[PDB]
Amino acid sequence: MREIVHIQGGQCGNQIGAKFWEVISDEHGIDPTGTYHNVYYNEATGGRYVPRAILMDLEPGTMDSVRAGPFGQLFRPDNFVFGQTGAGNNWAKGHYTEGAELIDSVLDVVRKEAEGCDCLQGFQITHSLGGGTGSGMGTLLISKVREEYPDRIMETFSVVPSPKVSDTVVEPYNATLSVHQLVENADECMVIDNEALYDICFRTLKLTTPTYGDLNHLVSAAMSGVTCCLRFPGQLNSDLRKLAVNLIPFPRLHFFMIGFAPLTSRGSQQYRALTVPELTQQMFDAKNMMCAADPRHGRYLTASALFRGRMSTKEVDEQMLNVQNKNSSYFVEWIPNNIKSSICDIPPKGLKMAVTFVGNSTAIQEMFKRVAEQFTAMFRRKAFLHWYTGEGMDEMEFTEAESNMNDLVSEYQQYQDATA
């Protein structure tokens, strides 16, 4: 019933997905053995539970991770489709040359896992954008499956690299290459970066050494809180499509920002309240989101707010109306009531409230801009091109890919200029 599949590729994708399965298991009350202590799990003999997920990569080193970290005995042994060469940070190695050889087996596993469903509500994938395995194989899989299941919809939590944090020196290439077709046949691209998470765990949680563990934990908890309102009874329920109408005004303006609330450290947790006013004051700022794009330098075409726990619908509703008609400038005026709310009846494990703030804004367009910046300074000189064209991939494509990007960002700016 309204079941969801799980594809996780690339190093970061696999890490975050393992953490997400951990958080879900600790939410539905599932210990690492697969017992209780159909939206995500499937039944198995002796009351065991199998997470509905497929793990793919071109180097099986990640196997170590998904077998060492907690909740590693949950996944299916047939759902580990691994390569041997490794894409090695290059997109071509994972979309034309080698990934094009195991993508068919991944498609076969996807078919064997989706036919076991009875009402498939959508897809959700997690992957990087420069990681050859991740970006390449995930984009190829998205292409194939959307060319296979036109009715269903995909909601990908791709993790773009922001240049404020330097990881590798070939990101812009793979980033633009994947964006060229991620705006094509994907309906919810919730982008995430690393600078936002570092700023969060420094100036919002006072953590000492922000480590990948807690970063992934935070983004996974947000990923869960996104769709939780379908996993339980609610007063104003939602799904992965009630977002696909409230948050996609145009078939390409679908790039989403994600924010989680509440977020505090121990002392702060002690000395503060947990109510609609405080959560609202906590979520509409800039540095409670997971995108290094200052939203107050743009607007929000639409903004959904999935609350969790139990409250008075009048209170959250009046708070939304008030925060809108006070931030009238930072919101878009040619659309009426651009905000949406949705309330479930079960809070997460640990607290008494929760807030997932999803936003189809017009600020993250600037993000593409800065990435495009590097692209030009890595293409005008044709630098680091002798690793791409040497794998069958024709160079010409790259050019038009960049052109496509323009259209995208253009649209955003154009809609920032519309009036009535």
Partner 1 sequence: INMMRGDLEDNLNQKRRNWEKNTKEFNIQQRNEKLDYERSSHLDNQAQNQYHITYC
44: three-class secondary structure by DSSP: strand
Q: Is 11 annotated as a binding residue?
A: yes
47 vs 233, beta carbon nearer partner 1: 47
Tell me: does residue 168 bind ligand GDP (CB under 6 A).
Answer: yes
Q: How many CB atoms lie within 10 A of CB 386?
A: 8
74 vs 247, beta carbon nearer partner 1: 74
Segment lying near ligand GDP (by CB under 6 A), choices 32-40, 104-112, 127-135, 405-413: 127-135
d(CA 72, CA 64): 10
Closest distance of CB 253 from partner 1, Å: 50
Residues 39-78 as x/- pattern, contact with ligand GDP by CB under 6 A: ----------------------------------------
d(CA 148, CA 386): 34
Residues in a beta bridge with 357: 259, 305
The footprint of partner 1 on this chain (CB under 8 A) covers a number of residues equal to 3
In the numeric block, which tokens belong to residue 32? Answer: 């690492």
36 vs 212, beta carbon nearer ligand GDP: 212
Closest distance of CB 197 from ligand GDP, Å: 6
Segment lying near ligand GDP (by CB under 6 A), choices 34-42, 111-119, 125-133, 356-364: 125-133
Cβ partners under 8 Å of residue 299, min gap 6:
330, 331, 332, 361, 362, 363, 416
74 vs 339, beta carbon nearer partner 1: 74
Helices and strands (H and E) in the chain: how many: 13, 14
Q: Which of residues 14-43 bind ligand GDP (CB under 6 A)?
A: 15
Tell me: does residue 134 bind ligand GDP (CB under 6 A).
Answer: yes
d(CA 414, CA 225): 32
60 vs 277, beta carbon nearer ligand GDP: 60
Q: Which of residues 20-49 bind partner 1 (CB under 8 A)?
A: 45-47
Identify the sign of the CA torsion 98, 101, 106, 111: positive
Q: Is 350 annotated as a binding residue?
A: no
Q: Which amino acid is at 30?
A: I
Tell me: does residue 215 bind ligand GDP (CB under 6 A).
Answer: yes
DSSP string over 341-410: EEEBS---SSSSEEEEEEEEESSTHHHHHHHHHHHHHTTTT-TT-TTTGGGT--HHHHHHHHHHHHHHHH
Q: What angle do CA 392, 395, 400 make, to 5 degrees?
A: 130
**Contact (CB, 8 A) for 53 and 25:** no
Identify the sign of the CA torsion 202, 207, 211, 215: negative
Q: Which amino acid is at 351?
A: L
Segment lying near ligand GDP (by CB under 6 A), choices 124-132, 230-238, 298-306, 361-369: 124-132
Residues 254-283 as x/- pattern, contact with ligand GDP by CB under 6 A: ------------------------------
Closest distance of CB 192 from ligand GDP, Å: 8
Dihedral in degrees, nearest 10, Cα atoms 102, 103, 105, 109: 140
Closest distance of CB 19 from ligand GDP, Å: 9
d(CA 336, CA 80): 47
Tell me: does residue 212 bind ligand GDP (CB under 6 A).
Answer: yes
Out of partner 1, ligand GDP, none, which partner does residue 225 contact, by CB within 5 to 8 A per kind?
A: none
Q: Candidates 128, 158, 238, 319: give the one binding ligand GDP (CB under 6 A).
A: 128
Looking at residue 331, the DSSP 8-state letter turns out to be B
Out of partner 1, ligand GDP, none, which partner does residue 168 contact, by CB within 5 to 8 A per kind?
A: ligand GDP
45 vs 166, beta carbon nearer partner 1: 45
- Binding footprint of ligand GDP on the chain (CB under 6 A): 10-12, 15, 87, 89, 128, 130-134, 161, 167-168, 194, 212, 215-216
Q: Which residues participate in the annotated binding site for Mg(2+)? A: 59
Q: Which residues participate in the annotated binding site for GTP? A: 11, 59, 128, 132-134, 194, 216
- Binding footprint of partner 1 on the chain (CB under 8 A): 45-47
